Amino acid sequence: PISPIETVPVKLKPGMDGPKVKQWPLTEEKIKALVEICTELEKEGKISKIGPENPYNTPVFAIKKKNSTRWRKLVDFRELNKRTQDFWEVQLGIPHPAGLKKKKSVTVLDVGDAYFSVPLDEDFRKYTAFTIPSINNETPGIRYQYNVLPQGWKGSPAIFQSSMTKILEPFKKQNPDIVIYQYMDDLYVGSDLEIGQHRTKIEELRQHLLRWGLYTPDQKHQKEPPFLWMGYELHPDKWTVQPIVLPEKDSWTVNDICKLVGKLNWASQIYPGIKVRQLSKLLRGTKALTEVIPLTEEAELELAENREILKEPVHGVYYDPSKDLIAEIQKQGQGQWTYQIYQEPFKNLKTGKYARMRGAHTNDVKQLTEAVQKITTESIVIWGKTPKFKLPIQKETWETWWTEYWQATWIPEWEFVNTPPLVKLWYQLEKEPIVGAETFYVDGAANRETKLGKAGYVTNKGRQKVVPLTNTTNQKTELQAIYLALQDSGLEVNIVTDSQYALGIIQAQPDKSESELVNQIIEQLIKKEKVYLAWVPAHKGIGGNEQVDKL
């Protein structure tokens, strides 16, 4: 039933105009199915007929369920959605079950269908026009335009969520104690009443909606745990995510890979790692919705990663606002981190892993910090507050990094957990030059045009090395020189360089890098007893640095 609720005024992007796309005939059985559906959808008031001064259209489609000989209208809105105004998405992620408190009585209503019942602004209506072919091209054509939010349109989700909100406004203030989450198709309702007074409010609310055209299937006997909500199974003192299975097939069409990314974008939020780059890219062009598109080498690879990603159950307990929030983090190795957020020991609210960095040179203490940061934000989004941290690092290790590191850095209040592998700095550079250790004056250069270069040093004892290099850069050679000096040196050494690039890398105390060279340096530095790096400008002729290179 078309709601008597005010319509949200919609507009087309400035300058742009309604869709003019015209479709081609399909099949006799389909052109006949459409007519039958369209006499059904015209019955109530969802859609209407027009054919005089409507000069727009949108592609039309009739598919079938692989379960029965039934065909339903798919209308392709990909075009209109490009010329339709943006709506602001007032959602900063999707609800997380672990952010739910327990309720004696819980019901989940089905409003999947309610959008078809919310009216569409009158003016924007003429742009939802679509026309179906004719059997053997007999009749001129059937022109239809929608009266309600069309399935698949851009603003359907936004205007319905917005309308559902206003409709619920009165009922939420009248019953300030029952909690009502609304996320598209589901409607979570939970109160701490006995089953019956709650079943009353339920029908009481099932009527309030009916009063505004929103007819919600009669299933208030959804008191039969578990309850299904948003892809989660809500048990009495536990919740589990229903496993998601991605369709694995031979050939793929535009409609299929599109529908695939759709559900992936869904799982991407419950599960981490879901990457949808390689796939979505196969939507190039204005290619028909039902046209087979071959999955590239990355598309089959990416679908494989995602598939093994969500291959296990996820579980947790509910939130208790009385108790504190504890988060614990462990170093998994190979730049991987694990964590658990709980209130009671071993009864986790949420668990997860953290994924290194998109840079080059890094370090455990740093890695750990970003991890704390990620958890803090995630916790504030889910619970509204930062959690207490249990970390595998001494208060002394952090004090050393927090004072010798040149960038502001901070970690909330934490407790040290004595569980290996502990995180620590693997070496410290010396602050003062070392007396008695041989001083190496390193340097290295390269020819940009031929990529050929050389790195070497010249110590005080008179020692001098010079190795020729193939396909390298000035930065690589400058680091290689630092490397020579460190191979050909005792337990203690002094290195003087003209490379500011290099000074900065080694001075940030990396313990793992992308550059094999840098790693070899790391590996080397750990083996030393006292290292001292010193900088001095170049082409100024300083020390012996000027008397290093010949070429």
Added chain:
Amino acid sequence: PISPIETVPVKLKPGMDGPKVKQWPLTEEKIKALVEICTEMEKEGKISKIGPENPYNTPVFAIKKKDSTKWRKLVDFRELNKRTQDFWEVQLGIPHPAGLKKKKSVTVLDVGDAYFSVPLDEDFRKYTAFTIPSINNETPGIRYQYNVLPQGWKGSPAIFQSSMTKILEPFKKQNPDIVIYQYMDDLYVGSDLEIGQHRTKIEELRQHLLRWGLTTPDKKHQKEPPFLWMGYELHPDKWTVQPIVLPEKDSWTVNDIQKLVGKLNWASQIYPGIKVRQLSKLLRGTKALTEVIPLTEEAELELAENREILKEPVHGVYYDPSKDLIAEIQKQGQGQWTYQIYQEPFKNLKTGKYARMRGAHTNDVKQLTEAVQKITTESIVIWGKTPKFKLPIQKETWETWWTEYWQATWIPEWEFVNTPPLVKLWY
């Protein structure tokens, strides 16, 4: 006047659209506050609930002013301001009070409340949309747009200039020596009166304004033991610059002269009159670092001459009000933070060293945050313009907690940089 006066037509800069900034997650404490604040705001018809058809959005949050118990809604209108027409309404006019920075005392009063009386152009309103978040995304955000001039918006002060001066007229005559400059939602009132005489003239001004509609922050008490009343009560007299110096000790090692010639080579970028040759030819030879190499070869020549060059202001350096100020902060260790403001690289208008809270302190973000606000306040008082900060912090570290220690009603422009080995070059 809140009277049914006509609105001033306002437009965005050409080819630019409204803001579409994401709302960051807030804590339950700040959400409940924003909710309470906004329910009253609309109850009085100053903001209005809006739908999803309004695509724009600016980030909103709460803080406490220095030493306060009252939450204050703060909307990050940086993007909106950037996209809003630069109002010709007395912009070059009211040339910044070059004497404001010269006074003994300067109080800062929050007059942003005045804005809530002048209506906002109905066509501009949609661009002031902000969203209040939900814990766990329980519900969609709570959305609103402003029906009146908003605090934090660059046009609120511009439009009100006209009735602001008309209220300051009686005061400015009775007290011809008191200087008053306004920046955004703040009134900067400075005098040369004894701190007691000053506070009296401020409470007088407060009351006057109060008699003309606008409310200002109260001067409740100063009982706070941990010294928390030194804010919003400036003393521009003590503002001193930080000179670039050189080390001085009896023995001089090879290393010392390398960390001396090096530092000086960089300094010569600022002052083209620094010779290095004397000390470079004294470093000749692949010698050991710890080797105490005689100061000789007429080293005291430049070593003491260049020590002098670092006592004269930079040649050609002056403030050009037609370009943004830039600010760089360096972490020096031990609650120490040095900084520089300039408009052209190496032509510093002012170098400094945020030192307050230089004690053993645990929180760098808190310190840098307070530093940024002190440097921002000094720029207002000196040049009447906030600078663009280059912050020595990782983007994510900063965004996770800066609003936890913010008390300014303005927010400057900032970016993130990875400080190199140039920190020590500022001692």
